[model samples]
Target chain A: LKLLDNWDSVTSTFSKLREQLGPVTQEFWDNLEKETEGLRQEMSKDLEEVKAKVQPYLDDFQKKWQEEMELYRQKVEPLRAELQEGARQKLHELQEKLSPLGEEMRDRARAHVDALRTHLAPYSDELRQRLAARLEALKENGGARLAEYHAKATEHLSTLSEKAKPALEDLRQGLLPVLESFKVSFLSALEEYTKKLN
Target chain B: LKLLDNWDSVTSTFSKLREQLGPVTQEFWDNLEKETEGLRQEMSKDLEEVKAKVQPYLDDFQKKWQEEMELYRQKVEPLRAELQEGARQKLHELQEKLSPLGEEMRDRARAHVDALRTHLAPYSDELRQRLAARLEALKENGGARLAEYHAKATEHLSTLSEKAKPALEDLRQGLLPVLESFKVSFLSALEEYTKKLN
Candidate 1:
């Protein structure tokens, strides 16, 4: 028991001595601090060197990005203008192509009217001769032929108008609106489109 | 030894008896059927749920990527066009500013020539009056004052002509070249600078 107690006392005294040496034995902490400070200083120096090396690259990259963007803008701007020009050109082309249809309709109408004139001319001449030869013969000769002529003429006119109506309406409604809408929309979407055509 | 042998034989017989259990095994398999069926159904249901949960996220992500790419393309394309238009507008503005400068230079040159003409006109009048006075003095004194008067008049006329030469040469050499160089340099520099400017 006494030996045990002596061993306990030695342990406690050694622990106390170790605690008392904390102030004097600061070399370990100091060494650790110095090592850490050295590491920090070395890292700082490395960081500065790295920054110096990277700064120009970063600046160059920024300059290149801006230059490339400017170049891209220059390249694309005319194309946008061209797109607008092309759309307007195409719209004009659509109008030009469609305008011929109007002339065609007029020609068709003229042909139909001419055909009607040829169909009615013989009957009218016959009726005029009958009237000059005898007035009673005039009514019987002219009435049925005139009625038949008008009926046939009305049918031909309706057919001709029907044939032309769809194309004319398409020009007035579908083609024109779509063309105008597309032209305006294309211009609105593309900034370079706002120039006078001439 | 006999008891041990008997025990071993009995154990072997029991094992064989257990092995020959067809009817009993059928009943045992039947009893397990419900649990296995339930497990199969549960697995199928869970697999379907797992597929359902994961599919939309993949689709959504794919759609989002497509949308983002489209937006990027849209944004970048217009930027390119605007950059081109901006550069063109800059050049046009510079041209407009420099246009008047050309006319101004030409006008200044013409004005300088006109000023020189106006200056010489008064000198011609002064010479005419001086010559008339010299002739009158010659008529009054005999040939002595005449030589002196003629010498002085010739010197004055030479001085006037010499001054006119320098003024005319300045108009031809100094102002003309300055105007021409300004026009060429401003046009060239404006074009070159516009190309380089942001």
Candidate 2:
């Protein structure tokens, strides 16, 4: 069954509608494509321009950070040496003072033993010999003990310098990856949009 | 030349600074990357979802519009035929009416011609022959001129239907490519941004 019997009237109405709407539809389509293309191009250009401006700065910053790490390493070594040397020098100075004090004590002890030798000669002689041996042992072992203290001070000083290194490494690893990923992300996004247009 | 003589102090200061600032810098970098990635994913997902929703509708609209065009063509043909037939029928009706008028004119002319023939005799006989031939020529040429007018009306009617076809064609050509290009632009942009994340 024919829904429309008046073919001419129906076609004429449709023709009129088409005449009215067709050009507008075409214009809309053209404009939509043109606008999309224009926006895509603009986005691409802006991304590239921004990337170009930023890339060098990023590279410079990375290099600067690395240089700073190296510079910190270079700058810290002498100070650590100075701290160790200063501790050792102090230990040596104190040992030097003690050496005279120990000699004075021995000299005093010898005088007292000589004064008592007339009344208690055999006891005084044996005590003097033990005292002499004890003083000699103290004199030899004192140097070793001082050396041990210097070694401990040196270890502490090196630990102080060592503490900062891992910090630099942590920052380097964390920040560098982020920067790299960001660069990769930005570039890929730009490439993707551009490729679509082409 | 060494800018820093106190290595230990410098490294200690840097270490402290690193310890204090390193976590913050890393956090900032991580957050920046995360936020950027989030935005990109959301943009890609939203775009794809929107396109997916719109694409079917666009296809359906295209199909509907095409069908409407076909429907218009199907509906208009009989109307055009009927218009031509109606024009021919009106022409026939006018011709039938014209025949009676022509006969009346001939009857009046015959009456006048007969009176003249009685008055003018042999001269009237030659005139009557010429007038009869003129009436026959008028009758034959009347159909030809009317037919020409009908043909011109038919051409005009056909032109009215023809007017919309090219408009639809123009829209079809212009709009379809735009739809395709738009689809490509959207998907590629999504793909490009999405790829960066992976």
Candidate 3:
């Protein structure tokens, strides 16, 4: 009879618990879903804005880089050509010197060939003429007019990227609080509950 | 005659410059475009991967959090109800004690009412019963079971977030080098070009 009475009490307690627990559990889950959705949306918005903020800088960099590059190319064209022709002629002369020797002698005479190249390199008339012309042009105009503009384009690329830092920080500010809230409300409760249980 | 000679010389120089500069400039820009495209594609891939890597954790966290919260709610329901009922009954008893102070006593017994409430505050059986039951609940298997499971849920959430760190780091590792390359190639050239011009 004593054992039977204990069993009845246990069964009664379980039934009463089931009746009381159902609604509370349902409400808890509903709140959890709401909070989770809120967090997801906030994160999504932050990431989307990050992408948007970066794109204009990229587009502007490409455009300005192209324009400034074109202008500099036009301005420096003749000097570059004169330099190229001088280099080609010098390379041809070195090859000629190497060609007269037998294969092994040519290999052995590598130092002589290099010496000849070093000696003749500075004396190329086209090379001297190009340098003189560029110097004259620079003295006349205070050096390449387009050079400043090209440098500015590069500077702005870095500046645009620097600007992105604050935007990313804004995302961090918004995200950090949400992350902290998760730890505070849910994880902290569990931590406290565990301590009390022990 | 002198002016015509000067004008012809200038035109000849301009013509030579245009022809010489065109192809070199075109090649430089072509390379620039190619490298820029590589950087853009790499960044796009990293951002896409970041989205993919994080979504699974977010979904799992929401699912698990809801499940654990529901379980915890169910576990704690009976104790919460008992406490809430005890509180309601205690409040009723206090109100009842004040009710029979009589209409004249009610009108003129504000001081008396305060004294009575203060005196009877600790004597509420419902309050004591609720407090004792809660203390016992925490000491018994009841609290330990719920607490252990709740803590496990919190642990899993943190673990999931920890796992995401490597994925985010992977994106950073891939992106940093590409961005550095862009700066080195274009910006360095501009800096050198500008210095020489000056």
DockQ list for all candidates: 0.00, 0.04, 0.00
Tell me the tens digit of each residue's lDDT in model 1 across A1-198.
434644554565566556545632454455445445655555554566557645754665565556556545754575466556655755555464456545754555455455446544754775565445445434554575478569767976797698579848866776687688767656653442222111
C-alpha-based local distance difference test score of model 3: 0.54
Q: Chain A alone, model 2, TM-score?
A: 0.23
Q: What DockQ number belongs to candidate 2?
A: 0.04
User: Model 1 residue A59 lDDT?
Assistant: 60
Worst 10-residue lDDT window for candidate 2 chain B reads: B136-145
Best by DockQ: 2
The reply for model 1, stretches above 4 Å from the true place, is A1-25, A36-51, A64-198, B1-12, B15-198
Q: Name the lDDT value of residue B31 in candidate 3.
A: 48
**Where's the lowest-lDDT run of ten residues in candidate 2 chain A?**
A1-10
**Residue-level lDDT for A187 in candidate 2:** 82
Chain B TM-score, candidates in order: 0.24, 0.25, 0.30
Model 3: CAPRI class: incorrect
Per-residue lDDT of model 3, residues A82-195, tens digit only: 445544654554465345434535443454455445544643553465456545544433323344435545554544454456435654655677688666666745654454
Window of ten residues with lowest summed lDDT in model 1 chain B: B136-145
